[PDB]
Amino acid sequence: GLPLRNYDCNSGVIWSISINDSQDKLSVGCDNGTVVLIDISGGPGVLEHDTILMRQEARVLTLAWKKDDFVIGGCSDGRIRIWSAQKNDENMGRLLHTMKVDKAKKESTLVWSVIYLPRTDQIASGDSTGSIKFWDFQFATLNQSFKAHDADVLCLTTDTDNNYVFSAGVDRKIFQFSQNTNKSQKNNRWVNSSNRLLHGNDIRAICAYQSKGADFLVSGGVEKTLVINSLTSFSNGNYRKMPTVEPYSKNVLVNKEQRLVVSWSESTVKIWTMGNYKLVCKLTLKDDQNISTCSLSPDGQVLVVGRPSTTKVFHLQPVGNKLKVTKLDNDLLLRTSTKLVKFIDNSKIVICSCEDDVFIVDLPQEVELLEVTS
Amino acid sequence: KTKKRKTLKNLRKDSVKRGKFRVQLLSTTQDSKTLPPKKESSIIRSKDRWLNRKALNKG
C-alpha cells in the first residue's frame, strides 16, 4: 500500500492518463498541451520516457487509444485531436487530424471525455455544452450530434460490443445511446434510447464491465457514493446505492473504562467523555500521512497512533475534566510501520508491520508466522 | 492568537533569506517515497471553479 515508484512526466501538470491496448505504454496529458508516452513494458516498478507527441497550446483534458496506433485527445480549446503513435512510420508523433466541437457563445468549450468505439470505428466525445458527438475516425468527420445533457458531460463509457454508450455529467443524469438494432447497425446510427436520474450530485466517474456472469455499470461522484446498474437492462433493471461509509476499517473506538469515545480523521484525534457528552481533548498531529489506526490501552492512559510511516505513543492524564497529553518517546515505534496494532494489557502491545512482521513491544519480540503457499 | 498562527507559519518555512542568497531545506527521502507529491492548487482549483461556475445555477 505504498508508492512503488514516483515517475516525473517531464512536462506540465497532468490532467489525464490512459493505457494502450497492449498495456505497454502510458499516455499522459499535460497542462502545457503536451502528450507524453511512458513505456512500462520493462517490468513492475519500471517507467521510462518513450516519446513526446507533437505539441500544442491547449490543455489535454482526456486521452484515448485506438489499439496501439493512434492517440485521441480532447482539449480545452474545444477541439478533438488525433496523434499518430505508430512506431516504424514516418508520421510517428504527428497530429493527423483536428476536429472542433460546437462552441458555447458566451463561455469556453472543454472536451471533457473522449472514447474510441472499435466496432463502428468512431469517436464519442462529450463537451461542456452537454452534447455527445460521434465522429468518423478514418475521415475525422461528424456523424451525429446529440444535445442530451443540460450541463457538462464529464465521463463516457461503452459496453463490450459497442452497442451502448453511456454518458454522465453535472446534470446528475445518465444517458443511454444505443445501436443494438440490426437496421441501426447497418446504417451506423445511434439513438438516444433513454436517461435516468440516480445521483444526488455530479457524476465524475463512470465505468462498465461485462462477463459471462457479470453485468455492471458503476458510477460515482460528488455525492461520495457508488451507484450500480446493469448495462443491458439499464432502462428497466434495478439499481443499488452503496452506503457512503462502510466501516471495514474502524475510525472510532470506545473505552469502557473512563467512558471515552475516540475518533481519528485526517491526522486529528478527538476524545469525548460521556456521563451528556463533553470533548475532553483534541490532538493535532504534524505528519501529512493520515492516521491508519489508533489503539487505546484498557486503562485509557496510553494512546498509540499508528501510521504506515511512523508509530507514535501519547500518554493521557485526566486533569480538570480534561486530558493532559505527553508524547512518550520510543525510537523503535517511530521507525516502525503500523498496519494493525492491539493492546495485550495496559503496557504491552502487538504490532503488525506493513511487511507482515508481528512483534511485541513492552513500552522487538518477533512472533513466528506460518508461511503461505503462493 | 494571530501571532501564534504566524509563529506557527514561521516554523513551517523551508527557506530563509541570507542576504542575496536564499538557503532552502531539502526534505527527507522517505517523505517523497512514502507519499505521492502534493497537488498544485491552481490546476485542481480551475476544474472545481468551472464545475461550480455561475452559469450552472446549481444553488
Binding site: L279, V280, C281, K282, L283, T284, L285, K286, K322, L323, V325, K327 | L8, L11, R12
Partner: peptide
C-alpha cells in the same frame, strides 16, 4: 475547543 486543543509541532518547538 481551543481550550482542550493540542498541537504537536508547537509542543515540539516548546
Amino acid at each position: 475547543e481551543d481550550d482542550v486543543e493540542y498541537n504537536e509541532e508547537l509542543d515540539d518547538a516548546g
